[PDB]
Design a binder for this molecule. Sequence first.
Ligand code: HEM
Ligand SMILES: Cc1ccccc1C1=NN(C(=O)c2ccncc2)C(C)(C)C1
Length: 432
Amino acid sequence: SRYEHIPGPPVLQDVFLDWAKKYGPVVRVNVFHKTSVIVTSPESVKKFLMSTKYNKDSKMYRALQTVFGERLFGQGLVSECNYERWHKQRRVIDLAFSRSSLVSLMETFNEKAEQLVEILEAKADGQTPVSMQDMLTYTAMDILAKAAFGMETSMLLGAQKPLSQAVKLMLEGITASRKRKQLREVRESIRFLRQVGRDWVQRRREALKRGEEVPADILTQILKAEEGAQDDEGLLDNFVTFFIAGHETSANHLAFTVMELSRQPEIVARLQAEVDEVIGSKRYLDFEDLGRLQYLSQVLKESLRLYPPAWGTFRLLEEETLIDGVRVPGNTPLLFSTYVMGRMDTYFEDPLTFNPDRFGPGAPKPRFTYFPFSLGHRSCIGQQFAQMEVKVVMAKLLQRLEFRLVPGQRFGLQEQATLKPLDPVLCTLRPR
Ligand code: HEM
Ligand SMILES: Cc1ccccc1C1=NN(C(=O)c2ccncc2)C(C)(C)C1
């Protein structure tokens, strides 16, 4: 009743889009456990996301913390909602995301991208159906495992099928809650994931002791954040957090980019030409190469406008506040959605047209209407990691292969924690 005065109704993101267009920039939604208010003006985006006065709503992030009673992300970097506890771990883990840290990861990006293209090239007979969704998730997972944790998962070669199963069941579990044996499959998968964590951490600890060669990475920092903690729960929260966050969205963004580009032959021809000019035949992209893939950068940004895997974020409004002429009561989750704003014609001209030129030099940058990595203090710690890795993978594909989507494959979305292609992006391939 306390929310009844707010405009609202008497893939869910698409329903939210319809509601925002019909009811304006502040709309009550009663889908989540609570009533929340979707705020879609750039004025609100700027006010709430760009200030440390506003923090994440813990009632919303509880669904990441714990799933069917099993600790999943716990109080890790994504799901910790208290500013001070968040800040303490952010500053330590930030060390793994410096320019100097990221530059050293180019080797791993190159090796796994090369392995993926060699695998695809062998199937490029213009006939064999290849799930690009699957191949890209395996590459993303193999990259993350090696880069962040020093482990070789070999999913690209069919290894670690249980591990991929567990991630899949746990993602479905997030959405399920947000019978008998689905609960079992989910619960086990989460424990599996945490048990993997304890394994690698034990391995890392063994290596360090008789001082084997142990290169500084994300794991180094998450360990450092927990130095002198009372047990390993905080450590394993971040293991799982980075295990999942460090591949799932990257994979999704890759899959969506490949899917969309399969109907964009003129953009594909421009991307192929850019890659031919900047890297040529070289089998390795350097760091300075990446910055020269300017058109590719723009394409990837446009892909994230229309297809953000992580569609938005929540903040807690503590005190009753006027928001764009609406009285929003205190103790209210505010939902921000780059998916919704990306598809509104008040913010983007012809919003459904895929146009990389929106992100060209000399184009007015979108002011608070576009945030696929979020904004402010709680923006994506892995944004530059992701940007580098997806560029490497995309550049290698474009260098070497032509993709055609199998007819019958759809362009629609599903929701499994994140947004991802409904279909497996089944393609036939030919060498360039
Ligand atoms: C295209 C790929 C990626 C996208 C679209 C993405 C998107 C996002 C978004 C929207 C948030 C804010 C979440 C919220 O408000 O609840 C976020 C935060 C985060 N992302 Fe990502 N992410 C990507 C890749 C990565 C990678 C590669 C890593 C790690 C290797 C990562 C780790 C995180 C973490 C740990 C946070 C929490 C940051 C904090 O609150 O301090 N993400 N990301
Ligand atoms: C944050 C978010 C908002 C809206 C909808 C979904 C998500 C998720 N992000 N996720 C990540 O792993 C992730 C988080 C941050 N950077 C990269 C990946 C899931 C836990 C899978 C779900």
